[PDB]
Amino acid sequence: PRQRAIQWGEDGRPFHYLFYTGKQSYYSLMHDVYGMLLNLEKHQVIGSR
Amino acid sequence: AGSRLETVGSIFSRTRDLVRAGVLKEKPLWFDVYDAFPPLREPVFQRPRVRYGKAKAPIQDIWYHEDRIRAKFYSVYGSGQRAFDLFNPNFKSTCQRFVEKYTELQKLGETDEEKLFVETGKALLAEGVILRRVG
Amino acid sequence: GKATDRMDAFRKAKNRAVHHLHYIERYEDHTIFHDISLRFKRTHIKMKKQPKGYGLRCHRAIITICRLIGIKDMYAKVSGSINMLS
Amino acid sequence: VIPKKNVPTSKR
Amino acid sequence: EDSTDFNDKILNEPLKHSDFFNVKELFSVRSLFDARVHLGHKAGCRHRFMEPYIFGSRLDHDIIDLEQTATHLQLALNFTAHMAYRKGIILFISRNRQFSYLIENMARDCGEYAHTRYFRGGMLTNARLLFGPTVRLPDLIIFLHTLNNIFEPHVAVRDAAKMNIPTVGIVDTNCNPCLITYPVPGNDDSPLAVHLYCRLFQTAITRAKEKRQQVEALYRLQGQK
Amino acid sequence: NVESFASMLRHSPLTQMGPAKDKLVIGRIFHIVENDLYIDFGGKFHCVCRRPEVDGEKYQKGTRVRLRLLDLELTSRFLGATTDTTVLEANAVLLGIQES
Amino acid sequence: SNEDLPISMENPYKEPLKKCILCGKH
Ligand code: FES
Ligand SMILES: [Mg+2]
């Protein structure tokens, strides 16, 4: 099975700024999607599931 | 083995004491910074209580002498049809322009209130200001 | 400590207790600094500062706790509800 | 002597 | 032999100066006033423990005394800078969803951490189970909003005190500052106020990290020769 | 000769305005959700106004508008509550667009 | 001391109390 690698270095500092949420991968994705929706505003089926 | 009794003293006192007792082998990274530059109030838990009987909060209402002039101006002439621009830190409304003229004439020695108010309206009309009385 | 088995309750209580340690000030490392009289719920505890050699003349549980703190000389009287947790 | 805890047995 | 000199020239030297990072140059009572930091909630929402910090009520709207905010902000920024200098883990916490994106970006930009999401029970008090026995917890928690979305204190305020982590917190007139180590009375709602706070902490943290590298680099160059 | 906070507060437009009820103010649209316009007008809290039926497309992010203020903060204490409930928004009526 | 400090006084903007349609009438 896929194992997530160690999330902090020898000094103990986590690599990801969203580590302490416990869901850094999920919330980093929501952060990226929310950021894209913002940039659009500033600028402005059958075969897929 | 830091103590989790957050309602007993403060993080500084609990940390300082366990360091003396030898329970904590090393001081935390923040302890020396807190000691050198402590807060104004030591962060000690307190239970908030409702006031009873004749106890009142010590907060006072903020009032100024010019508020009396502003209250009368809004009663007599209403709010100006000009729109407030609260983003401009130096914005002056018709009421503030009225208040400043009212203050100038008061410093010229006039002391009557009803007379000092009518002369102010005339001065602004001479300057081209629109003062539509509400009634 | 709570558990179905007694040995598990012992483990939980004692391991948790070290995370909720108080520091108790002692006069000359043997007694309290002043007489302490307080009520906790319905349990009244009156404690008296004592000189060296007086020993622990207190409720047996207070004796046990005082040896863990390091108090050697104190008088205490418990009145009202005698509840171990209170 | 409370029997000492043994986490290793059920370790994944 | 060489460690005592290291810790003395690098870790103990900044602690002998009242403003080692010059954080007083970052703000002024005027800069705070333009950001609307003095604006508090209505008197009916006032928390009793905030009365000492309230200048007064202007037509039933509480006004925060910026003279006190200025002194409290100096202490909080100074503390925050010293902790960043010492390479502490700084965690920003706020549940105000209007500013979640802004705060998460500010944390990433300064090289720190943000928790703007739902706070799950035990992130701090049960971290070893959730993250692992070797997990390092934050050395400083900065609250830009100390209340959760039901207008109660964020659970992390209580749990930060339980874990003996110092807290910096913006405390509005409806907040409880008793357990916040370095409270800063100020408006937490206005976008101009919140943006200002993020700039000040971001700048304080970034400056302290650059200062740490300058001192270390100099201490090494001089050590060889 | 550093200006004091008491001086800033006395001479601020928000202090000079007095009561906010029935006061015309200029706002700026900073966020839009469907036909909900979030308008900042210099106070602590923004107001939320529905897009007007006439010239609805003229109301965009950054568009400056005219408002008639009702309350700077909507708050009320309800039966059994120890503190006032606040919705964290101002009450205002959107009149139209401000033009030069 | 300082001229810009607030002064103690009664609310100048206070609205007159509302009256019933029969207030003052027999
Ligand atoms: S309000 Fe009814 S008699 Fe005055
Ligand atoms: Mg607030």
Query: Which DSSP string do the residues of B94-127 spell out, in sequence order?
Result: HHHHHHHHHHHHHHTT---HHHHHHHHHHHHHHT
Instruction: Check B5 against C22: CB less than 8 A apart.
Output: yes
Contacts with A17 from chain E: Cβ below 8 Å: 104, 107-108, 111-114
> Where do the DSSP E strands lie in chain F?
23-33, 36-40, 47-50, 64-71, 75-76, 85-86, 91-97
Residue showing tokens 């907040």: E175
Beta bridge partners of E39: E63
Mutation for B interface: F17, F65, F99, most B CBs within 10 A = F17
**CA–CA separation, B39 and E71 (whole Å):** 10
Beta bridge partners of E129: none
Looking at the CA of G25, which ligand is closest? Answer: 1
The residues, any chain, with a CB within 8 Å of residue E203's CB and separated by 6 or more, are E26
Residue B124 has which token pair? Answer: 């602004």
Tell me the CA end-to-end span of chain C in Å, nearest whole number. 16
Residue E147 has which token pair? Answer: 């209340």
Residue of B134, E142, C65 lying closest to C78 (CA atoms): C65
β-bridge pairing E113-115 and E90-93:
parallel
Mutation for B interface: C16, C21, C26, most B CBs within 10 A = C21
Residue B3 has which token pair? Answer: 């103590």
CA F28 from chain centre, in angstroms, equals 9
Looking at the CA of G19, which ligand is closest? Answer: 1
What residue spans of chain E are helical by DSSP H?
2-6, 29-34, 66-85, 100-110, 127-131, 155-162, 191-224
β-bridge pairing F36-40 and F23-33:
antiparallel
Query: Would the CA dihedral through F75, F80, F83, F88 be positive or negative?
Result: negative
* A9 at E interface, C-beta within 8 A: no
Residue G7 has which token pair? Answer: 């002064």
Residues in chain F: 100
**CA–CA separation, B34 and B66 (whole Å):** 46
What residue spans of chain F are helical by DSSP H?
5-10, 13-17
Atom of ligand 1 nearest to the CA of G24: 3
**CA–CA separation, B11 and C49 (whole Å):** 29
User: String of b and e for B68-94 (b: at least 16 CB within 10 Å)?
Assistant: bbbbbbbeebebbeebbbbbeeebebb
Residue E49 has which token pair? Answer: 């423990």
* B3 at C interface, C-beta within 8 A: yes
Residue of A5, A16, A11 lying closest to E104 (CA atoms): A16
Decide: helix, strand or coil at residue F73. coil
Sheet holding E54-57, edge to edge: E39-42, E61-64, E54-57
Residue E213 DSSP one-character state = H
Residue E176 has which token pair? Answer: 């409880």
CB E69 within 8 A of CB E193: no
Q: How far is the CA of E85 from the centre of ligand 1 (A)?
A: 69
Residue of chain A whose alpha carbon sits nearest to that of E110:
A17
Decide: helix, strand or coil at residue F86. strand
Burial class from Cβ neighbours inside 10 Å (0-12, 13-18, 19+) for residue C59 reads middle
**CA–CA separation, F27 and F51 (whole Å):** 14
Please give the helix or strand (H or E) that residue A31 lies within, else none: helix A24-43
Phi, psi dihedral angles at F12 (to 5 degrees): -80, 145
G23 Cβ inside 6 Å of ligand 1: yes
Residue of E37, E46, E34, E81 lying closest to E182 (CA atoms): E81
CB E113 within 8 A of CB A19: yes
CB C32 within 8 A of CB C47: yes
Please give the helix or strand (H or E) that residue C47 lies within, else none: strand C43-49
Domain span holding position E139? 3-222
Please count the other Cβ atoms lying within 10 Å of the Cβ belonging to residue E96: 18
**CA–CA separation, A14 and A12 (whole Å):** 6
Phi, psi dihedral angles at E219 (to 5 degrees): -65, -25
CB E179 within 8 A of CB E84: no
Residue of E177, E162, E182 lying closest to B11 (CA atoms): E162
**CA–CA separation, E144 and E197 (whole Å):** 8
Phi, psi dihedral angles at D9 (to 5 degrees): -60, -50
Phi, psi dihedral angles at G6 (to 5 degrees): -60, 155
Residue A32 has which token pair? Answer: 């990226």
Phi, psi dihedral angles at C4 (to 5 degrees): -70, -35
Please count the other Cβ atoms lying within 10 Å of the Cβ belonging to residue F55: 10
Total number of domains constituting chain E = 1
Residue C48 has which token pair? Answer: 């008296």
G20 Cβ inside 6 Å of ligand 1: yes
Residue showing tokens 């100024």: B64
CB E57 within 8 A of CB E114: no
Residues in chain E: 225
Closest Cα to atom 4 of ligand 1: G23
Helices E66-85, E191-224: axis angle to 10 degrees equals 40
Please count the other Cβ atoms lying within 10 Å of the Cβ belonging to residue E143: 26
Helices B65-77, B94-107: axis angle to 10 degrees equals 120
The residues, any chain, with a CB within 8 Å of residue E9's CB and separated by 6 or more, are E215, E219
Residue showing tokens 């400090």: G5
**CA–CA separation, E17 and E23 (whole Å):** 12
CB B95 within 8 A of CB B68: no
**CA–CA separation, F51 and B111 (whole Å):** 51
Please count the other Cβ atoms lying within 10 Å of the Cβ belonging to residue F6: 19
CB F47 within 8 A of CB F34: no
CB C76 within 8 A of CB C58: yes
**CA–CA separation, F14 and B96 (whole Å):** 12
β-bridge pairing F23-33 and E140-143:
unpaired
The residues, any chain, with a CB within 8 Å of residue B95's CB and separated by 6 or more, are B70, B73, B74, B80, F16, F18
The residues, any chain, with a CB within 8 Å of residue E222's CB and separated by 6 or more, are none
Looking at the CA of G17, which ligand is closest? Answer: 1
- What dihedral angle (degrees, nearest 10) is formed by the CA atoms of E87, E93, E97, E102? -20
**CA–CA separation, E35 and E53 (whole Å):** 18
Please count the other Cβ atoms lying within 10 Å of the Cβ belonging to residue E8: 10
Q: Which amino acid is at E86?
A: R
Decide: helix, strand or coil at residue E142. strand
Residue B123 has which token pair? Answer: 């001065």
The residues, any chain, with a CB within 8 Å of residue E221's CB and separated by 6 or more, are none
Please count the other Cβ atoms lying within 10 Å of the Cβ belonging to residue C83: 11
Residue F50 has which token pair? Answer: 């529905």
Residue B56 has which token pair? Answer: 């009142």
Cα angle vertex E23, ends E115, E110, to 5°?
35
